[PDB]
Each structure stands twice: as C-alpha cells, then as structure tokens.
Paper text:
Two variants ([name] and S247N single mutants) crystallized in the centered orthorhombic space group with two molecules in the asymmetric unit; the tetrameric biological unit could be reconstructed from two symmetrically related dimers. The [name] substitution did not induce any structural changes in the neighboring residues; however, the substitution for a smaller side chain results in enlargement of the volume of the enzyme active site pocket and loss of Van der Waals contacts with the pentyloxy substituent of oseltamivir. The methyl group of the I223 side chain in the wt enzyme forms a dispersion bond (C-C distance of 4.1 Å) with the methyl group of oseltamivir. This interaction is not present in the [name] mutant, where the closest C-C distance between V223 and oseltamivir methyl groups is 5.0 Å. The energy of this interaction can be estimated as ~1 kcal/mol. This explains the 30-fold increase in Ki value for oseltamivir upon I to V substitution. The enthalpy change in [name] NA2009 was partly compensated by a more favorable entropic contribution of 0.6 kcal mol−1. The [name] and S247N substitutions did not have a dramatic effect on the oseltamivir binding pose. Rather, small structural alterations—such as loss of a dispersion bond with oseltamivir in the V223 mutant and changes in the hydration shell in the N247 mutant—appear responsible for increases in Ki.
Residue numbers in the entry:
A (entry chain B), B (entry chain A), C (entry chain B), D (entry chain A): 82 to 468
Write the structure that this text describes.
C-alpha cells in the first residue's frame, strides 16, 4: 500500500460516460434494501464504494415511516460496492451517523460520522474502522459535514464542517486529518458567505470545494486551499446558476446571488482555470432533472453563455443531491486525476404521497472520448404497498 | 497474473457434459432474483461467471411489468458465479447496458456495456471496472453487440458490433482491444450478409465468430480473423440449418438461405476443419428445445446429413439464446482450448401470459468421454403471483 | 497446499461432541432456504462444508411441490459453510446432480454429480470446478453413489457406485480418482450382497465403507480396500442391527440379516478392530430418533450386547440419513484421523401432510473428553403456509 | 499472525464515543434477521465481530414463538461483522449453544458453546472452528458462562463458568485455555458470593472480571487473577450500585448489598486503581435506560458520590445486558488496551405483548477526546405482524 500522491492535475474532459446505476428503489419494492439518503461514491486504489446514510429501516416496511426526518439515533453510515443496491446482506457498517464523509488515503479508509443531539453533536473519526479522533460541535447548532467524499493528498485528507444556522450566517471550518487524527484546523473568515455540504476534490496538490449556500445564494460558494490550510473563497461567477432553487439564467455574480437564494441542494462543480463543468438540476424550482454544462469562462465570468450541455436526467424526472468523486492515477493508471460525479434520485416525501423518503443513484466519469446525453431516472412506481 | 496465450487449438469433443444449471426462475418465485435476459458465461484463469442484462427489477414484483421491452435506462450488466441465481445479494455490478459483452485477458476483466438512446448509443468499455474507452453509434441505429463473451489472444481481446437495420443491410465492425482501449477496428465489407449477436471464440491465435442473420438467412453467418483484423466471411454450408426460425433440413447454401430467413435467435457453432458442432433449437419455428449436432462436413458442405445428435432441452420446453464460451489451458491445465456452451431458457412474454419476461440458464462443456442426452428445462410453473 | 497423507489411524473416541446445527427448515419458514435432501459434510485442510442436493426450489414456495420425487433435471449439488442454512445467497454451485459425492485431497475439491435419464445416467467429475472425467451407467438402471464424502489418501480419492436394482442383486464398483480423473476401477464380486449409499472413510492408508442393503439385509454391509483396490467384503456382525427398518435386537449375522431386510436408510459405522461405533435410528420401523452405540465386539461378533449408548435425537423426533465425515491431521493438528458424523432430519413427505420434503442437519465429532446425550431435533412446526 | 501480548495497561478514558448500532429489530420487521439474545462483541487483530445466541428462528416468523425461553436444542452461537444485522446470509456458524463465550488470542478464535440438558450440560471448546476440548457440568445444575468475550494474554485465554443455583450459593471456576485446550482450572473459594455472566478483560497481564450476583447483591462482584490463576475476590464498593434491580444510591458495601439483591442483569465495569467506570441501567427496578458513570473512588470506597455521568439510552427506553470488550494495541496501534462496551436492547417478552423476545445492540469505545450523551435506543415499533 502507498499513499495517494494527489499531485497531478484534473484530467480535461469533453463529456461524461455512464459508470453506475443501482436501481435501489425499484429493487426494494420486493428485496431487502435500506431506506437511504445522502449517498456518495468514494474510491480506494482498488475499488469504488457507495456510502450512504441509512434510516435503520428497509423499503416497503413500516419502519420506513417518517423518513423525511433528517436526524435520529437510528441513522448509520454504511457502504457497499458501487452499483449494488444497499442491503443488509451486502453492506459494511461504517459509523453511527446522520451526517458523514469518507475518503481513502491510499492505505486505509477514513470515515467521519456525526451523531448525538442537535445542540452538541460529535463527529467520530475512524481510520480502518478504529476510532482515531472526535470533534464536538463548536456552535451548538447541528454540527454537520459534506455528505460526499473528503479529499486526500500525500497522506493528508481534508474536509469542511459547518455549525450554526442554515438560514443565516454560520461558522465553517477546514480540517486536515492524517491517519484519522485531526492535525490542523482553521475557521474560514467568510462573512456574508454560506457553506453547506461541500463537494471537495484534489487537483495539483490543493483542494477545491464547491458547496451549497442555503442562506442567500442561488450560485454556489467555493473554497480552495493548500495542505497548510491557506485558503481562498468566492462564488461561481457564471450566470448559469448552479443551485436549486435558482432564477432563470441571466447575468451572474462573483458573490452570492440573492434571487431565489434561500434553500438549496447539495451539488458540485469542477474548475478548469476560468472555466467550469457545472452539474445542476434542470428545474429552477424543484429537484427535477439533471444536466452537465461546460462554461469555458464560468468560474470567473458572469455571462450566461455556455458551450456544451449534456443531459443526464430528464426535466420531468426526480433528481436530488449530487457530488464529485475522483479516481486517482494509483487506481486508473492515468497521468491525471479523473473527475466523476454521482446523482441521488430522491423518491417519496415531500413531493410524492408516501410515508417514506429514499433514493437511488447514478454515476458518471469524465472522458475525452465520445459520449451522449440521455435520461437515466430512478424508475420506481410509487406509491408502494406500505403506503 | 499472466495473459492468456490463446495459441492452442480447440479441444476435439465427442459430446457435451452438463456443467451448470441455475434454476433462476423457479427460485425467483420466492427469492430475490433479478429479471434478466441475454445471459452469458465467461471465465478467467480462476473462475467462471454468468453475466446478464438485468431489468432493474426482481421477479414476482410489480417492476417486472413490461420486461418484454429490450432497451431502457434501467438495464444493467451484472455478473455472479456460474450456477448461482442472479440476486442483488450475490451479483457484481459491471456496467449500465442494454447490450453487452465481456471477457478476461488473463489479467483483468473487460466489460462492454451499451446504453443511451437508439439514435446515439454509446458503448462504455471498462478494464478492471475502470472506464477505459467509449465508442459511439456510427449509423445512429441501435449500436449493439454480442450478448456473449469476447475472445482474447495474447493480451488482445476482440469483439463485433453492429449498427443499422435488423431487417436489411447493416454495418458490422470488428474491434481489437488491449487493456480496455480500442487499438484497431475495421468495417466488414459484407454486402448481402447480416451479422447480429456474434458468438466468438479463440482457436490457434485466430478468432472465429458465428452469428445471427436477422434479415434473410436461416443458416448462420460467420466471420473469422487474425490479430491484425484480416478477416474472412461466409455462411455455414450445412443443410442442418442453425437459426430459428428455419426450414426443415434440406440441401443448404454457403450463402444466406432465404427460406424462413427473416428474424432469428442468437446462437453459436464450433468449427473443426470441414466439420461443425451446431447447437440449435429443436423446433423449426419457435424457441423450443435444444440439441447439439456434429456434422463432419457441415462447415463447408451443403448436404443435410450429420453423424451425432445429443438432446439438451426437449422440443416441448422453452429455450432461447445460446452462446459459446471457452476454458483456456491456463484455467484447465489442458493442452487445448476447451469449448463449452450455455443456453438461455426464456420464460414469460410473448409465449406465456405474464407481465414479465425473464430467463434461466444451463451450460455444458465438451468432453471426449461418455455423455448422454436429456432435457434440462427451466421448470418454473407460470404464471406467477404477480401476474 | 499439500495432499492429505491419510496414513494415520482413526482416533479412538469415547463419545460425541456436538459440532453443528443449521435449523434450516425452521429458518426457511421465512427466509430463502433451499429445499434439500441428501446433505453431507466434508472438510478441506482449512474448512468444513455442507454439501446437499437441492430441488431447485425454496421452502414455502410453490416450486417445492412434489419434492418427495428423487430424480429430476432441476436437482443440483451445492455447498455452504457448515452450520449455515443452504440459501441461494451463501451457497456455491457444484454440479447438476440427483446423486453425489465430494471430497478434498488437500489441494482441490473433487465433486461427483450424476444426472441424466434413469437408463443412461452420467457421473460428471470436477476437480476445482473444472470437468475432469465422466462415467456412464454400465447397467442402465439408475447409476448412483454415496450421498456422502469420498475418501482420500496420498493424492488418490475413492468412491463406490451402484447400478442395477434397489430390490435385488445389483452391480457395485470401486473407483480410484486422482486430480478428478478415474485411474482404476474394479467391480466388486458380491453375490447375495447389496450396497447402496456408502459412507467411506480413510484409516491407516486404507478405505472402509459401511453401506445400506436395500434388498435383504437389516444389518449393514461393508467393503474395505487398499489403494490398489484390493478389497474385502462382509456385513457388520452385531445383533445391534444398524439399518432402518430392522428387527428388535437379537443374535446377528456376519451375512445379510433377512428379517425386515428390504428397504433401508443411508448410514455409517466406524470400525475399531473387532469393535464398532454404530449410529442408528431409535425406531425399528421409521426414520425417528438417533443414537450412537459402542459395541466392543460388534464388527465381528453376533451378540446383542453393547457397552455405551449416547442419545442424539429422541425417539419421537424425525431423523433421516446419516454419514461419516473425517477431520485429517492436516486440519486439526492431531496425530490421528478424527471421526465425525452428520444426521439429516427429514421433514415433510411421506410422514407429514405437506406438499414438500426437505431436511435440516446436525453433526458431531468424536472426542475422548466428556460428552452427553440429548435430543437435537429439527424443531420446525409443520405444516407450513404453502401446504 | 502473532499472539496478543496483553501486557499494557487499560487506556485512560474521559468518555465514550459511539462505535456501532445494528438496528436489528427494526430491520427484521421485513428482512431475514435472527431472533437473538445474549449478544456480545469481540475483536481480532484485524476486525471486530458481534457474537450472539440465535433461537434457530427469524423475526416475524412463527418459529419466533416462545423465545422468552432461555435453553433449547435449537440455540446456536453465530457471529457477524460488527454493526451488521445478524442474518443467515451474513453470519458465521460457531457452535451449538445456549450459553457462550469467545475471544481471539492473536492467532485464532476460541469459542465456547454450552448445550445439552440442564442436569448435564457440556461446554464445547473450538479453536479455529475445530473442537479442541470439552468440559461437563460438575454440579449438574445449568453449567453456564460469560455471554461476553473471554480475555487473552500472551497466548492464554481465560474465562469463568458457574454451576449450581442462580438463587443461592453456587460453584464458580476459572479456566486457562491455550489453543482451545484447558491447561489449568481452579474453583473459586467464594462463600457468600455469587458470580454469573462475568465481563472479563485484560489489563497489565492480569484479568479482571465484573459479574452479576443473582442471589443477594445489588452491587457487582469481581474476581481478578494472574496467569497462574491466583485470584482475588470482592464486590465493587461504590454506593452507585451497578446491578438491576438495585436500591436508590446510598452508602455502599465492599461485600454484597442485600437490598434488592436477588435477580440481576449482566453488566460490566472497568477498574482504574481506586476508581471505576460503571455502566448501568437508568431505572433502579427495570431493564430501562443506560448510562456510564465515572466514580474516582468507587472501586474501593463506599460513598454515593461520582464525578461524571454520560447518557447512553434514555430511561423510558428498553435496555438489557451489557458487557466489556477491548481493542488491543495489535489492532489499534495504541500503547494501551482500549476499553469498549456494548449494550443489548431487549424487545418483546416479558415487557411487551409479543410472542417473541429478541435484541438489537449498540457499542461505544473509550476516548480522551470530546464526547456527548444521548439516547440511542432500539427503535422498533412493537408488536409486529406475527403477534
Ligand atoms: C405511518 O404513520 C402514519 C402517521 O402516524 C400512520 O397513519 C396513521 O395511522 C393511525 C392508526 O390507524 C391513525 O390514527 C388514528 O386516527 C383516527 C382518525 O383520526 C383516530 O380516531 C384514532 O384514534 C382512536 O383510536 C386509538 C386506537 O384505538 C385510540 O387510542 C384513540 O384514543 C382513538 O379512539 C387514531 O389516532 C392516523 O389517522 C393515521 N394518519 C394518517 C395521516 O393516515 C400510518 O398508518 C403509518 N404507516 C405504517 C405502515 O406504519
Ligand atoms: C401442489 O400440487 C397439488 C397437486 O397438483 C395441488 O393440489 C391440487 O390443486 C389443483 C388445483 O386447485 C386441484 O385440481 C382441481 O381439482 C378439482 C377437484 O377435483 C377439479 O375439479 C379441477 O378441475 C377442474 O378445473 C380445471 C381448471 O379450471 C379444469 O381444467 C378441469 O377440466 C376441471 O373443470 C382441478 O383438477 C387438485 O384437486 C389439488 N389436489 C390436491 C390433492 O389437493 C396444490 O395446490 C399444489 N400446491 C402449490 C402451492 O402449488
Ligand atoms: C503458445 O504460447 C506459449 C506461451 O508464450 C509458447 O510457449 C513459450 O515459447 C517460448 C518461445 O519458444 C518460450 O521462450 C517460453 O518459455 C514458452 N512459455 C511457456 C509457458 O511454455 C508456445 O510455444 C506456443 N505455442 C504452442 C502451440 O504451444
Ligand atoms: C403493467 O403496466 C401497464 C402499462 O403501464 C399498466 O397499465 C396501466 O394501469 C394504470 C392503473 O390501472 C392505468 O392508469 C393505465 O390505464 C394503464 N396503462 C396502460 C398503458 O395500459 C398495468 O396496470 C400494469 N399491470 C400490472 C399487473 O402491474
Ligand atoms: C510487552 O510485551 C512486548 C511483546 O513481547 C514486550 O516487547 C518485547 O520485549 C522483549 C524483551 O525486552 C524484546 O526482545 C522484544 O523485541 C519486544 N517486542 C516488541 C514487539 O516490542 C514489552 O517489553 C512488554 N511490556 C510493555 C509494558 O511494553
Ligand atoms: C405460540 O405457541 C403456543 C404454545 O405452543 C401456541 O398455543 C397452541 O396452539 C395450538 C393451535 O391453536 C393448540 O393446539 C394448543 O392448545 C396451544 N397450546 C398451548 C400450550 O397454548 C400458540 O398458538 C402459538 N401462537 C402463535 C401466534 O403462533
Ligand atoms: C441541517 C442543515 C442542512 C444543510 C442545509 O440540512 C440538510 C438538508 C437536506 C436537504 O435539503 O435535503 C437533507 C440533509 N440530510 C440535511 N442535513 C442534516 C444534517 O440534517
Ligand atoms: C435490436 C436488434 C437486435 C438483434 C436482432 O434485437 C435483439 C433481439 C432480441 C430477440 O430476438 O429476442 C432480444 C435482444 N435484446 C435485442 N437486442 C437489443 C439490443 O435490443
Ligand atoms: C435409487 C435407489 C436408491 C437407494 C436405495 O434410492 C435412494 C433412496 C432414498 C431414500 O430411501 O430416502 C432417497 C435417495 N434420493 C434415493 N436415491 C436416488 C438416486 O434416487
Ligand atoms: C440460568 C441462570 C442464568 C444467570 C442468572 O440465567 C440467565 C438470565 C437471563 C436473564 O436474566 O435475562 C437470560 C440468560 N439467557 C440466562 N442464562 C441461561 C444459561 O439460561
Ligand atoms: C508527484 O508525486 C510523485 C510521487 O511521489 C513524484 O514522483 C512526482 O515527481 C510528482 N510530480 C509530478 C506529477 O509532476
Ligand atoms: C509527502 O509527505 C511526506 C511525509 O510528511 C514528506 O516527507 C514529503 O515531503 C511529502 N511530499 C511532497 C511532495 O510534499
Ligand atoms: C504477444 O504479445 C507480446 C506483447 O505485445 C509480443 O511482444 C509477442 O510477440 C506476442 N506473442 C506472440 C506469440 O505473437
Ligand atoms: C505418514 O505419512 C507422512 C507424510 O508423508 C510421513 O512423513 C510419515 O512417516 C507416515 N507415517 C506414519 C503416520 O507413521
Ligand atoms: C504417495 O504418492 C506419491 C506420488 O505417487 C508416491 O511417489 C509416494 O510413494 C506415495 N507415498 C506413500 C507413503 O505411499
Ligand atoms: C509468553 O509465553 C511464551 C510461550 O509460553 C513464554 O516463553 C514467554 O515467557 C511469555 N512471555 C511473558 C512476557 O511472560
Ligand atoms: Ca424476503
Ligand atoms: Ca441557495
Ligand atoms: Ca460563460
Ligand atoms: Ca434468420
Ligand atoms: Ca453433412
Ligand atoms: Ca435393509
Ligand atoms: Ca456385542
Ligand atoms: Ca443482584
Ligand atoms: Ca465515590
């Protein structure tokens, strides 16, 4: 085993090739599939895994009742191989958690699982399944983290956590973790910014995170930093607005776009100089559809012009959260860090007339070979028997 | 790990010994078994696996409705150990796919999964589960492939894909793939031929494929080629016609036999000089029954005489697709490439009054020791509870 | 890996310590557990496995209907770790089979699976899952074999097969198999003997088999042989009669005991000079109960006196088949071959009012430390929902 | 593989970080989950496992009827990875048992499973799954053991067993076991003490056990000993009484506290010089709630003062047994033996109106970093469909 270097650049990509689809909700109509939300993908040097927050319940069973609820003592972070349904019969137990992150440094898995009360939650860090550190809420108001993979460079892994209001100014911290132990942290000085649910990836030995402003931004905030946690902050400038909800596309801002700014959805983007690959919902108002857009000046420029759009999920179909994941050269044999992404396809409450909420997933990897747009939706027929 | 050499000849065989039977449909009446079609077997130097195209659904569940439909965004290529039922609890996720192939080069698995819209489908190639290439539709008319194993010689693996009409002239391409990357391709110049769903195997460092003419041939077309993709084409000459439907046996042709030539079924045959081992249905008109026939001059000669017939599935029982698979010396310890075959046993629509279509499988390997004919049919009692 | 020597003597034992219990039928009331009969245990240098003949159906499903029937094209030889229920989700596929044997030579598993028609059945031999030989019926009347483990000494494994009537004189052959290939066979010259379903074990480089006389013997026949297949034959002389059905105990015979001789049950015994450890049902008329009896002169002496009885299953509870299995020094670290046994606990038809027949199992290993009698029955409550 | 040294001291700990939660009962409402009680955790140098006593039945099936009953021939010791539900599809079979212990010496697992009749029960010892010893009841009155992990130092593992009344003086024995063989034992001379269900851990090459007085003590008895089995005995002195039932806290005793002393619950404590970490129920009278208390003089001092309390399960929620488990340096990389604990959350009879009794579990590990109190209860909604 060798630590992931993390020192190559992100691979340039022209489009997105489909990588996985689990069909979890369709399969759970009969099979024994966990009720889950907040899935994400992360890879080791040998395999990729889907992590997810269970609700300690199975689909089509009465204990799925009320699973719109975000935080409970029953939620657990578990993982299974990519593309398989999350069952009790194929899932590794990771941590007790209602908010999470995970990443592999080339040697072992780091998992971060937050549980406990809203006023005093505690993140439990594990390295190779052994508890190695904890960090407690510093603002006493729902300590919470990425819901996607952390990022690793040369034996150090990095994450972001938030504590404070989800509808006003909060507090945001960056962490450097080695072998599951926090070795450095800093509080971001980000007045008038809001960071939730960061999608962070490594690129040329530095970390870039694209997040969710739940307070007053319909474009996405970003934070980038080096191994010593020297950081920069901004908002994606493109008028191709990335959040949901959002306005119709128009001239953007390099600060928070107030129009339709409150609320949000976890997402991601990939920076390539001045340009950006944006994944977003197709609907401006609801978690419906998904598309990939290449805007060659959208990181730093405010116009609403773009060059390429690739369809992923059709506008009338359910989508949900999305997040980055990477494939390092140690896994692929390539000379660059490959960007990939996943989409959560949320079924049930609040939009559908069920007792439960759960998701399935799809994922894609960036290539420079030919690709095509389509719709790969969840495909379950609701309601279910239990509803 | 060492590349398969693929340089020995096919083992001579006098009969077919039963190797596996999964009983999937029987077991799926209660257990959590995928709705599948287009199964196939392929081996590594250590094990054999069943690959298959799921429908993103389980047997005896409502989401199995409409599974006569061939292409959807829910279909996935997955695999499980040979002889086990395909379940979410024992199946490896391979690719998102409504047409597929796979093969092991001695080092890692190559999978090929085609998804996307009919007018612009994309094959995603993976090597050890990592995307290594893509190829897009070149005729914009259902890019499609073998539905059985590709063939590997000395670190290069080979497949055939078709694009264009299934009821007229189409376009057929041969590919050479190394570590999941396309390194050579050629378009077969085959006016008046039709190639679908090729069953391809290695034999003395060259590849032989026996395929399905869906346009106007009731005998099977073949294509053989070396590593440089220098190819030859023809049709199996025997009057023991190989396709389904077909006429009653009579004097054959080394070109397409027009009588009952439209439509077809995936199949295979094994060439031994002038001779041929033909696997075919027992019914001339329907996907019923299965048998193996040794015709010692049937590759190159048009008579309707043969020497051996071995019963596999009775004429009153449902059959389906069939395909070759091989066991190389690196797996068996033999001095020759062993020929084997599988049969898909299709249940449900259109022949039976169900909401769904699914298959089970049986397989056999060639031996020079004593064998026997019998019928090993699917055995499920239809309809099911869901119907 | 090293071949099992097989040259030590059987360990002397004073009693039987409980080793496993699977509770398969109780668990299959809800879970996905195969309908099985003819289970047996066999060990490698690293683990022990339960082998069994499925009916290609699950408990409590309609396809379990009619499973009193012995031979069908749906039956398969599968295996799982000892003590686990046989499910599609934990079982390795071995062979298509309605009669079987298996054993590990220290390097790889040999499996023998007989399928095909009653008049022409064929045993398929596999070594490490690859077909290595076949043998066809020589009398055209249900070729059949042990339904328990074969026996291995120094790289050679040994079995017995029968072909011919189960109610009159038949033909019995001994086989020596190396790396899955038959290298020698002999027909036993056993006029007036009847051998079915032999339980064979190694002891000081020679094989001893204790079998079932279905024709006219209520004591058990035996055959012992060396590596060159030089054999001896006899019947267990004890008046503690071993078969079921049988008479009440009384003076025995060193030939077949005619009283209640027709029919039978598979069983076993362990020879220790003139003495014998006999496992038998408690009922003289039905497959009910089970007990272990130490008769210090019962191999060669005809009295009905014995020294020790250990209860295993109570007289009012269902039992079934039983068989030997051993644990070699390569597995245990001991200086002798440890004797063990299993019992099949048959539920359903013919004795119970169900549509199905299936079994669970228990097993024990011989020790020289303290032990105790009890009853470890199946414990399912019949009928089931499907009945 | 190397023997665990067991020569470092217990790690000092300021609080308890949540490690696992299985949600078994919730999941078993639909999935195939064993009815279990008497779970426990134990670790190797590579992983931690949950061991448990099944009832040979699944939740929400008829065979779960009557599972308030403690001892039957259907109960089996099995194990699964920590945090996963105990299912037939993920559980290793260990032993036939209605009382058990297990522990890993660094090389292989030792399991101890007691079965047989109440008047003559036999413990079967296995090492790497092979029977290595037995010990029979010496008082003919329910030979029984820890229901939690045994303790290993330098290749010797240690346990305690009891035989005789649970409501009066009984007989208690300590065992030293090497490679699954009993090499030493001694009968504890403990007139007027009562020891049941010991929770034993290693600490500086010696073993400390904290147990249950079911006769006449509401504080917990302890026994400590070196590798030669030279032992000391006493009761935890603290007026923070550890058993359930118990009185309200008040001045304690270093002998058995008679008030509310009959009956009990399995538990544990960790000694740190004069101090103690006590895990106990929150209710004085019922198996409800759970908490950890640090009493810095509570091992040797009788006051009812303590310094820290951490909430684990709320007073209105069901709890159950609890026990210690450790993580050795060979697993963690630490310089001390880490203390952890599990809690069984009992559902069903006698407190709830069901046909069955079963449990789920939670576990925590000791840390010197920040922690928080909460309630992590079972969460199933009873009764179930079967009731
Ligand atoms: C998922 O959770 C939902 C929400 O709890 C649940 O639906 C609810 O089911 C309950 C039980 O059927 C309903 O509660 C009843 O409502 C009626 C009508 O208002 C009341 O009269 C009932 O109270 C009487 O009966 C009780 C029991 O005898 C007495 O204790 C009480 O004093 C009254 O006499 C009772 O409250 C409730 O109306 C529904 N709610 C909705 C929106 O449907 C659903 O069943 C759960 N699903 C699963 C699978 O668990
Ligand atoms: C397991 O297998 C058993 C045995 O087959 C099966 O029980 C049988 O079920 C069938 C279907 O219910 C029964 O067959 C019927 O018997 C009646 C009474 O004799 C006949 O009148 C019926 O025939 C009429 O109806 C048919 C259908 O419309 C017509 O085709 C026919 O011409 C007649 O009009 C029919 O034969 C049979 O009686 C039982 N047998 C027993 C012993 O119960 C059982 O249901 C199977 N269980 C499972 C779970 O699969
Ligand atoms: C088939 O390919 C094998 C594997 O490469 C050939 O065997 C090798 O031959 C070369 C050149 O003569 C030797 O240097 C190697 O030592 C051989 N390797 C092994 C593992 O045997 C073989 O000659 C080829 N052809 C046939 C028909 O066997
Ligand atoms: C199988 O699928 C068909 C096609 O969707 C279902 O038919 C629909 O059923 C709904 C509910 O009754 C109606 O609103 C539509 O009129 C039907 N559509 C069509 C196109 O027929 C059918 O009900 C499904 N069958 C089962 C057994 O699930
Ligand atoms: C605990 O046991 C370890 C393991 O045996 C001891 O470390 C060994 O000490 C011996 C004798 O001094 C050396 O020869 C070995 O090289 C040591 N082995 C290892 C792996 O370190 C250690 O001294 C003991 N005690 C404590 C408190 O650590
Ligand atoms: C749970 O087990 C009890 C005890 O065996 C069952 O009670 C028996 O039920 C049968 C069928 O009604 C009767 O013949 C007996 O009179 C009952 N025996 C006793 C001792 O009560 C009970 O029915 C079972 N309950 C469930 C829900 O399965
Ligand atoms: C608590 C604020 C946070 C970010 C806005 O809300 C998230 C929004 C969610 C959402 O918008 O769907 C679901 C998340 N499970 C929830 N996170 C937690 C920890 O509860
Ligand atoms: C699309 C043409 C092609 C070959 C004739 O049709 C196949 C025939 C089928 C058939 O004859 O059963 C089923 C195959 N799933 C289908 N392939 C695809 C990709 O849809
Ligand atoms: C065919 C004769 C043979 C030995 C007497 O009958 C066996 C008896 C059986 C029995 O007595 O229960 C069940 C066996 N499954 C059957 N064997 C086969 C191959 O059918
Ligand atoms: C038999 C006495 C013993 C300790 C008091 O009872 C235990 C108490 C139990 C309890 O208090 O819940 C359940 C245990 N399963 C039981 N142990 C056995 C072996 O039956
Ligand atoms: C990246 O790190 C590797 C691994 O240590 C090192 O050898 C290489 O020089 C670095 N430089 C790059 C990618 O330019
Ligand atoms: C990677 O980390 C190691 C360990 O701290 C350090 O010695 C080395 O300089 C680092 N390499 C780079 C390229 O930063
Ligand atoms: C096999 O491929 C290797 C690597 O390309 C090549 O050098 C070698 O010549 C090939 N062997 C044969 C027998 O063609
Ligand atoms: C048994 O065989 C072993 C392994 O080859 C050999 O070394 C030994 O001498 C034999 N003799 C015995 C058990 O007496
Ligand atoms: C064991 O078999 C090997 C291979 O045939 C042989 O050379 C050896 O003599 C045999 N050993 C004994 C003790 O029979
Ligand atoms: C550990 O056990 C070994 C083997 O018995 C022994 O020789 C050694 O002295 C023991 N070590 C300690 C530290 O007691
Ligand atoms: Ca089920
Ligand atoms: Ca927003
Ligand atoms: Ca732009
Ligand atoms: Ca045709
Ligand atoms: Ca011919
Ligand atoms: Ca008889
Ligand atoms: Ca005698
Ligand atoms: Ca007490
Ligand atoms: Ca105190």
């Amino acid at each position: 085993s060798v630590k992931l270097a993390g020192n190559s650049s992100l691979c340039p990509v022209s489009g997105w090739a489909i990588y996985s689809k689990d069909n979890s909700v369709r399969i759970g109509s009969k099979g024994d599939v966990f009720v889950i939300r907040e899935p994400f993908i992360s890879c080791s040097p040998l395999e990729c895994r889907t992590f997810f927050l269970t609700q300690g319940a199975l689909l089509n069973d009465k204990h799925s009742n009320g699973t719109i609820k975000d935080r409970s003592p029953y939620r657990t972070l578990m993982s299974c191989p990519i593309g398989e349904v999350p069952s009790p019969y194929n899932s590794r137990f990771e941590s007790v958690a209602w908010s999470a992150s995970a990443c592999h440094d080339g040697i072992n898995w780091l998992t971060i699982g937050i549980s406990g009360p809203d006023n005093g939650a505690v993140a439990v860090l594990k390295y190779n399944g052994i508890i190695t550190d904890t960090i407690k809420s510093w603002r006493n108001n729902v300590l919470r983290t990425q819901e996607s993979e952390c990022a690793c460079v040369n034996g150090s892994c990095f994450t972001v956590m938030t504590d404070g209001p989800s509808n006003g100014q909060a507090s945001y911290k960056i962490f450097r973790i080695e072998k599951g132990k926090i070795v450095k942290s800093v509080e971001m000085n980000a007045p008038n910014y809001h960071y939730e649910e960061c999608s962070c990836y490594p690129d040329s030995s530095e970390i870039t995170c694209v997040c969710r402003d739940n307070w007053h931004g319909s474009n996405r905030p970003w934070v980038s930093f080096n191994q010593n946690l020297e950081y920069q902050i901004g908002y994606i400038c493109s008028g191709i607005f990335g959040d949901n909800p959002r306005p119709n596309d128009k001239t953007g801002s390099c600060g928070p776009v107030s129009s339709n700014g409150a609320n949000g959805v976890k997402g991601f983007s990939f920076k390539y100089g001045n340009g950006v690959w944006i994944g977003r919902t197709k609907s401006i108002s609801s978690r419906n559809g998904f598309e990939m857009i290449w805007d060659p000046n959208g990181w730093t420029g405010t116009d609403n012009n773009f060059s390429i759009k690739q369809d992923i999920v059709g506008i009338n179909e359910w989508s949900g959260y999305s997040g980055s994941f990477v494939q390092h050269p140690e896994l692929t044999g390539l000379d660059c860090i490959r960007p990939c992404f996943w989409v959560e396809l949320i079924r049930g409450r609040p939009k559908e007339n069920t007792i439960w909420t759960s998701g399935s997933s799809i994922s894609f990897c960036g290539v420079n070979s030919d690709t095509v747009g389509w719709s790969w939706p969840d495909g379950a027929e609701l309601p279910f028997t239990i509803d």
